[PDB]
């Protein structure tokens, strides 16, 4: 089953992602194929999949940027029916905005079926053009047709997945305790994480004993990523991944506060030094506390 | 012995505090008697007392606002010698800026003796006027003279004192763990704590599931008090008190993130709700984690 989380949905045939055109919140904004840049935030191309509790393999798909929902226009079963962004809610009963999402016959890509119409999300003609129509279209669960096959590239971790990445790490103190604040986290590329750090003003901050020392830098960086999340996205029901860690050196006679983020493969953490914007696989401290 | 910490130094005879005139960082800025408002930040009237490791009962006195040091002009023993703010360091050997501070004959107020001159800090003529001269003056450790007696009104807590206030509280969970980030904290009046909250922009922030929920409010409020500390004071070697707490309700089926501060008497904590600016003696959660 598709997990709850944020996905970049990429056609199996051509390198086009499902895109809410101009990220517009207007009802009836076309959802189109568009090219994408890996290891960036693709601002109009991120979809929060919310499982519908009492319907198997069925979701709403909320555009992270617009906060509007993937909607089959008037729920029509006609091939070529418009797929648009439309106002809704995460657990709607509106079958226009309900999508059964299951593995295709290649066992890696998915097909996306409208719960009402039983027609599939289709990149019309496999057109690779920026702004290519996406429509509801007749099809089957089993056929190879790449127009209707979609890789769900997972952009978020659960709290359980973040916990696992930390526990993997070789720099966790025996006394470590972790404090989980949210359920589902957007993982930033370092390029974006760095940009939030720059736009925070922290690069200009001076170290001062107690009054602006490591703990103030680390907490200011987490607050800045929290502020960026709320200000950047209109969807709800997720957080941005940015950890704070307290650590102690091997000698046990010096402590440090710093940040951490997750690798591209979501499997491991990477330490971030908010006093200089460095990423490190070893920051010279073993974490005894984290909150994220 | 006088503890390390921040003091509002108030004459024993008249309601004048030791004041660095206009908070100026200029060398030779007069230190004067000035009236004060209790339960405010008295911006020009706060002094960080740093104990000199290998000299008994002897300190530097750094003006929290200016970052400059109480200085007996050319270390003269002449009665009426100017006491000014002057550039220095927390552990200087300059005897102009070293002060032996011990209980007076009334056992509650102190006298302040220059280590070099062995003359005392004196509110000349006990003048209660705003801008009254303070000078180094002949005297003795034992005499009653109120011109040379000073209440050291303690405005800061150690980490150990903050730990004690939390442990006192009746809303601490069995599983509580506390994470101490600094050593010495300025305690804010609620009036100031509230102002930092207002000036943060948090009063305008909307609750949003995960993306700006209780943990984001609580951490944004701690970051705002950290930013206010650095931006407001030029002295180093202290922090501003603002805690973050995670808590769980009696039923054990709901958790909440919030802030806390300390009472005027420094003995107890008070909970702060950053989603509405309320102070509560009971926020309906028992803390299982704090960092401050
Ligand atoms: C059958 C029809 O369902 C609803 O209308 C839908 C639209 O629904 C969504 O948008 C409307 C406002 O336009 C409203 O906010 C609703 O709660 C939301 O789910 C939408 O799916 C469009 C485009 O496909 O089709 C229908 O107009 C409902 O509002 C109608 O009353 C009616 O029951
Ligand atoms: C190249 C082309 O691929 C397939 O046709 C697709 C269409 O396929 C879907 O709709 C058709 C009916 O039009 C049929 O129901 C099929 O089972 C279903 O997958 C559709 O994807 C459109 C729009 O993108 O493009 C092509 O027409 C295949 O059936 C054709 O024989 C042909 O190989
Ligand atoms: C005896 C004298 O001590 C020092 O001068 C002090 C002044 O000292 C302080 O300010 C000066 C700059 O004016 C400098 O930054 C020094 O490090 C700092 O402690 C000051 O206390 C004044 C006013 O009472 O008196 C003396 O001028 C030293 O700099 C001199 O070289 C000389 O040794
Ligand atoms: C009212 C006045 O109080 C005392 O005199 C103080 C001064 O006291 C201090 O300096 C004098 C010498 O001038 C002497 O050394 C004394 O032991 C010492 O405390 C001084 O505080 C000045 C400046 O504020 O004010 C008064 O002159 C007392 O000795 C006087 O008899 C008289 O009662
Ligand atoms: C917010 C906006 O993002 C980018 O423009 C989007 C565009 O983004 C995708 O396509 C571009 C090339 O046009 C790149 O491949 C990006 O990596 C993709 O994410 C599309 O989403 C279209 C259609 O909705 O809208 C544009 O605004 C970027 O080019 C802009 O400078 C800006 O940052
Ligand atoms: C920063 C400045 O603070 C206040 O003025 C100070 C003044 O403050 C003290 O005296 C005033 C009355 O003049 C009140 O009692 C305050 O409670 C005291 O803290 C003095 O420190 C003088 C001498 O250095 O400087 C002034 O700037 C306040 O009146 C101003 O509006 C302003 O907030
Ligand atoms: Ca600090
Ligand atoms: Ca959050
Ligand atoms: Mn290590
Ligand atoms: Mn949360
Ligand atoms: Mn309780
Ligand atoms: Mn610290
Ligand atoms: Na439209
Ligand atoms: Na379901
Ligand atoms: Na002067
Ligand atoms: Na000492």
């Amino acid at each position: 089953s598709l997990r709850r989380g944020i996905y970049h949905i990429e056609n199996a045939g051509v390198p086009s992602a499902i895109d809410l055109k101009d990220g517009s919140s207007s009802d009836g904004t076309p959802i189109v194929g568009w090219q994408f840049t890996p290891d960036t935030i693709n601002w109009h191309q991120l979809w929060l999949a919310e499982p519908i509790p009492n319907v198997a393999d069925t979701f709403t798909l909320c555009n992270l940027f617009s906060g509007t929902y993937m909607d089959l226009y008037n729920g029509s079963s006609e091939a070529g029916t418009a797929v648009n962004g439309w106002q809704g809610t995460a657990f709607t009963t509106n079958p226009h905005q309900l999508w059964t999402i299951k593995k295709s016959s290649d066992g890696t890509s998915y097909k996306i079926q409208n719960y009402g119409s039983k027609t599939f999300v289709d990149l019309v003609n496999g057109d690779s053009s920026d702004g290519a129509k996406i429509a509801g279209w007749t099809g089957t669960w089993d056929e190879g047709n790449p127009h209707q096959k979609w890789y769900f590239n997972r952009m978020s971790v659960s709290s359980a997945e973040a916990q696992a990445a930390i526990a993997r790490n070789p720099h966790i103190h025996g006394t470590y305790r972790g404090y989980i604040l949210d359920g589902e986290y957007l993982v930033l590329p370092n390029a974006t994480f760095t940009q939030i750090w720059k736009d925070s003003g922290l690069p200009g901050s001076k170290w001062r004993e107690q009054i602006y020392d490591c703990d103030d830098f680390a907490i200011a960086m987490k607050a800045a990523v929290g502020k960026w999340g709320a200000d950047s996205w209109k969807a709800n029901g997720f957080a941005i991944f940015c950890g704070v860690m307290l650590g102690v050196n091997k000698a046990g006679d010096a402590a440090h506060a710093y940040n951490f983020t997750l690798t591209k493969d979501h499997a491991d953490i990477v330490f971030f030094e908010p006093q200089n914007g460095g990423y490190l696989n070893d920051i010279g401290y073993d974490s005894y506390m984290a909150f994220y």
Side-chain angles (χ1 to χ4, degrees), chain A:
Chain A
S1 266
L2 190 75
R3 310 169 260 180
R4 189 176 186 284
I6 306 166
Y7 296 92
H8 190 248
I9 307 171
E10 306 168 4
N11 185 256
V14 299
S16 292
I18 301 195
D19 183 298
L20 180 61
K21 199 176 181 169
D22 206 37
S24 179
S25 59
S26 301
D27 289 343
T29 298
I31 290 168
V32 290
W34 208 281
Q35 67 177 297
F36 56 93
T37 313
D39 297 324
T40 74
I41 300 302
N42 290 286
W43 277 96
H44 302 160
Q45 298 181 356
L46 293 183
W47 299 89
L48 181 61
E50 282 268 32
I52 303 305
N54 45 42
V55 184
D57 299 295
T58 300
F59 307 81
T60 55
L61 288 176
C62 189
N63 191 279
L64 214 72
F65 181 78
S66 74
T68 62
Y69 286 80
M70 181 182 294
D71 182 295
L72 182 65
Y73 189 57
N74 285 326
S76 179
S77 61
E78 186 171 336
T81 292
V83 170
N84 307 303
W86 209 284
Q87 64 176 295
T89 58
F91 304 110
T92 187
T93 57
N94 178 358
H96 303 178
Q97 289 174 9
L98 293 176
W99 303 94
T100 306
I101 307 175
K102 300 175 82 178
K103 281 307 182 70
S104 77
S105 56
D106 73 33
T108 291
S109 65
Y110 288 84
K111 306 197 58 150
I112 313 166
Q113 184 183 51
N114 183 264
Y115 184 71
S117 73
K118 307 306 185 192
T119 60
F120 289 93
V121 175
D122 184 304
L123 183 58
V124 176
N125 279 324
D127 189 345
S128 60
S129 298
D130 293 334
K133 182 180 200 187
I134 293 176
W137 209 282
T138 56
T140 72
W141 274 106
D142 56 289
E143 64 190 345
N145 180 4
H147 304 178
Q148 300 185 358
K149 296 207 298 204
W150 299 97
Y151 295 116
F152 275 64
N153 185 358
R154 187 161 160 80
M155 296 290 309
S156 67
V157 291
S158 64
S159 50
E161 278 157 7
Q163 270 190 135
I166 297 156
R168 209 157 194 251
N169 198 273
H171 309 288
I172 306 305
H173 194 258
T175 67
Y176 170 88
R177 299 288 309 276
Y179 297 87
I180 297 168
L181 297 179
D182 293 306
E184 193 73 26
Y185 301 90
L186 180 63
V187 180
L188 298 183
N190 288 1
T192 302
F193 206 88
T194 287
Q195 191 62 48
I196 298 165
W197 175 71
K198 287 186 178 167
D199 288 340
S200 78
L202 270 179
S205 293
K206 300 303 181 36
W207 189 96
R208 299 167 60 191
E209 184 194 337
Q210 292 204 51
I211 193 62
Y212 218 70
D213 63 327
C214 43
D215 43 270
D216 299 290
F217 278 88
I219 286 166
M221 176 59 185
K222 177 145 182 61
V225 172
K227 179 170 176 48
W228 176 91
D231 290 356
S232 293
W233 308 106
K234 294 181 194 73
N236 300 319
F238 69 103
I240 316 303
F241 196 77
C242 179
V244 168
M245 265 172 176
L246 316 179
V248 58
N249 67 351
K250 301 298 286 221
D253 67 358
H256 188 46
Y258 45 96
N259 295 108
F260 68 101
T261 185
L262 286 158
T263 52
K264 185 184 172 159
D265 63 8
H266 294 186
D268 282 286
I269 62 168
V270 179
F271 303 112
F272 180 77
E273 179 48 76
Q275 288 188 51
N276 58 38
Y279 299 88
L280 302 95
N281 291 325
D282 181 2
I283 195 161
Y285 300 79
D286 297 327
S287 170
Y288 61 89
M289 193 268 258
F291 57 95
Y292 52 95

